Amino acid sequence: KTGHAVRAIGRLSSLENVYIMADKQKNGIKANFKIRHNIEDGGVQLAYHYQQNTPIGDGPVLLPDNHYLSTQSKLSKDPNEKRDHMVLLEFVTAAGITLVSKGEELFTGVVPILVELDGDVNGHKFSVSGEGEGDATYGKLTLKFICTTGKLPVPWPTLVTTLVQCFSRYPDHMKQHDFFKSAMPEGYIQERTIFFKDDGNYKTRAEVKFEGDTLVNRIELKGIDFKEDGNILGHKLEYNLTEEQIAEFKEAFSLFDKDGDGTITTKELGTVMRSLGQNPTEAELQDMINEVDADGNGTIDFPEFLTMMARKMKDTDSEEEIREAFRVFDKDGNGYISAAELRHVMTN
Ligand SMILES: [Ca+2]
Ligand SMILES: [Ca+2]
Ligand SMILES: [Ca+2]
Numbered sequence: 241k242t243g244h245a246v247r248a249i250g251r252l253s254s255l256e257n258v259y260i261m262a263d264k265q266k267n268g269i270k271a272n273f274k275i276r277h278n279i280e281d282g283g284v285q286l287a288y289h290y291q292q293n294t295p296i297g298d299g300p301v302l303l304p305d306n307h308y309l310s311t312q313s314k315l316s317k318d319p320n321e322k323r324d325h326m327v328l329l330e331f332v333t334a335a336g337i338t339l340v341s342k343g344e345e346l347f348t349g350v351v352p353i354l355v356e357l358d359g360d361v362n363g364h365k366f367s368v369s370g371e372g373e374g375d376a377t378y379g380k381l382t383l384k385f386i387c388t389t390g391k392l393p394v395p396w397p398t399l400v401t402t403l404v405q406c407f408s409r410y411p412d413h414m415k416q417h418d419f420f421k422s423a424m425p426e427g428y429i430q431e432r433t434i435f436f437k438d439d440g441n442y443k444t445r446a447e448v449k450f451e452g453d454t455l456v457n458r459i460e461l462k463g464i465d466f467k468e469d470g471n472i473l474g475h476k477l478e479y480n481l482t483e484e485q486i487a488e489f490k491e492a493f494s495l496f497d498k499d500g501d502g503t504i505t506t507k508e509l510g511t512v513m514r515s516l517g518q519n520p521t522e523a524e525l526q527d528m529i530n531e532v533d534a535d536g537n538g539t540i541d542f543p544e545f546l547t548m549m550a551r552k553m554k555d556t557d558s559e560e561e562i563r564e565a566f567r568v569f570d571k572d573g574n575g576y577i578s579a580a581e582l583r584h585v586m587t588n
Contacts, residue, residue, distance in 0.1 A: 242586070244492035244549070249513060250565055251552045252528040257336070258309035258405075260419075267301050268294040268428070269419045276555040277397050277471070278478040284556040285471045288435040289401060293419065296449060297426030299342075304417035307336040309408055310534070312551070313400060315480040323386050326396040328372075330381040332408045338536040340415045343424030346450065347376035347406065353383060354456045355403050361463030362440070362473065364393035370403055374455060376421070379409030394463070395477040402432070402444050404457050413536060425450040440466030440473075481550055493545050503539040504529070515588035516568055 258273045271291035276284050295301050314329040355370030372383030385396075385403060406420035420428070427449025434442040446459040466473050496504045496512055506525035513520055520528070529540055532548040557565070569585050570577045 241488060242492060242495060244488060245495050245512070246516075246565055246568055247552055247557075248492065248496075248545075248549065249516070250557070250561060251548055252509070252531060254561075255531065256551070257531065258311065259306070260304060260308060260417075261306050262303035262419075263292075263294075266294070267303070268292065269304065275401060277395070278556050279471055280476055280478050282556065284558055285439075285477060286437040286558065287398065288437070290433050290435075292429075292431045293423075294429045294431075295423045295426070296428060296447070297423070299426075300422075302341055302416060302419050302422040304419055305337060307334055307414060307417055309334055309405065310547075315397065315400070317479075318384065321384075321386075323388075324390065324392050325387065326385045326399075328381065328383045328385065328400065328403075330379075330383075332379040332381075332405070333534065334408055334410045334414050334417070335534050335536060336530055337414055337417065338530070338533075338538055339413055341418065341422035343406075344415070344418065344421040346424050347374075347421055349377075350375050351407075352454045353381070353404060353407075354451075354454050355383065355385065355459075356457070357399070357403060357459040357461060359394075359461040359463070361394055361442070361461070362466045362468070364473075365389065366393055368392070368399065368403065370457075374404060374407040376407050376409060379407060381407055394472050395475055396479065397477055398434075398436075398442075398472060401434070402442070402446075402459060402461060404448065404455060405430075406448065406455070411536070423448075424455075436466075436470075436472060439470045440464055481553070485553075486546075489546060489549055490542065492549075493542055496540075503541050504545070505539055509540075516585065517571075 258271055260269050260271050263269055273289050275287040277287065279285055310333050312331045316327045318325060318327050351374045353372050353374050357368040359366045366387060366389045368385055369388050370383050370385040374381050406424060410418045430446045430448055432444045440463055442461055442463040444459055444461045446457055448457050471477055496508050498508055506529055510520060510525050532540060532544055534544050567573055569581050571581050
């Protein structure tokens, strides 16, 4: 059962959020991050994102310290809709900094959203159209997307990140780091390249601005070098918790929180890893905690620990990640794990 504990450490060693830095050369920001698409019959497809945003207007913008965005997405179907479509529910929150603009005032209530995409992937063209609402106070998006060209030639999940980060909920201690809203109403250019592992890549250019009362995302997408047999063109990707597991998670939370005060410190996280033959520094342990530390108080409470495990249970890991999760039990590293190599890890 305490396999839960090993992947917790794997997750805390991973980088799963949307990382933002100021553009140190000009107004704007850069971002990079990783998406895991679950392959239908098991496996994972990874997509590496590299992102640049630049104001359209001349006025000043907020250039943030490094921090990140954290995401929850639910994709569904509308049972009374016959066109190729996607209903999306999304929560996005900023974090990563422990312990303001004009355009920010445009986001205090529910804002209507229009989304317009023209795409071309390996010569298969398509258009997508989206409408819905954004609630920045809760980092909440609700949208319906329609493929207006008939059938979509790529899986819907691969488009999500392309199809309005000015709707992120920035916590009160981080308001001065919201580049996205400060760029409004005139808005910003958002550019990405997206690299599907062992496959093609998408390139995207988007204009994000207010047109009247409406926040508009207008996008061009060109995709090349895809395999007609790969997970994208071949439509191999999945479309989208028991309180039994919540019991299994609080029990795995106790293994770290040895003094049971409801929170995990760098002190306690260090103990567990050292009993698994690792030796992380104080700076590493703070960085590990900071990746899943929603409130920025430097400790992982149980809400914060749940979110990370719900997300980790949602996503299949790659082989390079299961490899390392495997070589924690196999001490001699021979391919076959002995029931003695288990007990060592177990006791610890
Ligand atoms: Ca504790
Ligand atoms: Ca916390
Ligand atoms: Ca062995």
